Design a protein around this ligand. Structure first.
Ligand SMILES: Cc1cccc2nc(Cn3c(=O)n(C[C@H]4CC[C@H](C(=O)NCc5ccccc5)CC4)c(=O)c4ccccc43)cc(=O)n12
Ligand SMILES: [Zn+2]
Length: 208
């Protein structure tokens, strides 16, 4: 792989920062918690920093190109990603060519941890955890990524993003919340090199 995983200690500001971002972005979802489960907070088991020389080279190369195409600003954002492919991603990086066989074009990120949690076991939560088939499992360890995402010039729309590529002049697409539209933001990129899987978070949802 070339990937090293570095464990962050709970007493480190960096761990605490990531956990705070995860905990403070939990929101109530319009499915009544069906996809991701019913919870008010997570139990964070472990937070690991993902290091891979080649993946970083690719991410930094693309970031420079995007910066050049966007008035010298790459417009990086930290965003959550949840999907059943976390293990592949930390070793091989993001690969947009897998967007079809996954269930979708595009790689999707959320600014709310709880939105990404809805997707960890699949679209709509799939059938939940492998062991108990429970989308609201309080026992099984879940994983999500908190990633660096190069957004460049973002195309904003108040509708669900279903495009094949970013529009001309843009590097990402954001589906924006509105009245009678989306409830939470979703961020899409169309090239794997525009995201780096920086933090791997292992966690449980907690029963209220
Ligand atoms: C509506 C919606 C809102 C907010 C978030 C959200 N998140 C997802 C996550 N998700 C997803 O992005 N895909 C497409 C990806 C294509 C890249 C692929 C990947 O990089 N694989 C790595 C790799 C490298 C080499 C070799 C093999 C593999 C990961 C999945 C999904 O297909 C997906 C599938 C199930 C659940 C969430 C998914 C979706 C979404 O609709 N979101
Ligand atoms: Zn379970």
């Amino acid at each position: 792989s070339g990937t090293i995983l570095l464990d962050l200690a709970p007493e480190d500001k960096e761990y605490q920062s990531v956990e705070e971002e995860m905990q403070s972005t939990i929101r109530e979802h319009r499915d009544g918690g069906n996809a991701g489960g019913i919870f008010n907070r997570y139990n964070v088991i472990r937070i690991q920093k993902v290091v891979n020389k080649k993946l970083r080279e690719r991410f930094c190369h693309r970031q420079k190109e995007v910066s050049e195409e966007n008035h010298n600003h790459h417009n990086e954002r930290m965003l959550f990603h949840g999907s059943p492919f976390i293990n592949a991603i930390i070793h091989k990086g993001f690969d947009e060519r897998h967007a079809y066989i996954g269930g979708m074009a595009g790689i999707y990120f959320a600014e709310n941890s709880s939105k990404s949690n809805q997707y960890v076991y699949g679209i709509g939560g799939g059938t939940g955890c492998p062991t108990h088939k429970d989308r609201s499992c309080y026992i099984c360890h879940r994983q999500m990524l908190f990633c660096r995402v190069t957004l460049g010039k973002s195309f904003l729309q108040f509708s669900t993003i279903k495009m094949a590529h970013a529009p001309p002049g843009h590097h990402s697409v954001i589906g924006r919340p509105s009245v009678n539209g989306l409830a939470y933001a979703e961020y899409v990129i169309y090239r794997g090199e525009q995201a780096y899987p920086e933090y791997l978070i292992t966690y449980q949802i907690m029963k209220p």
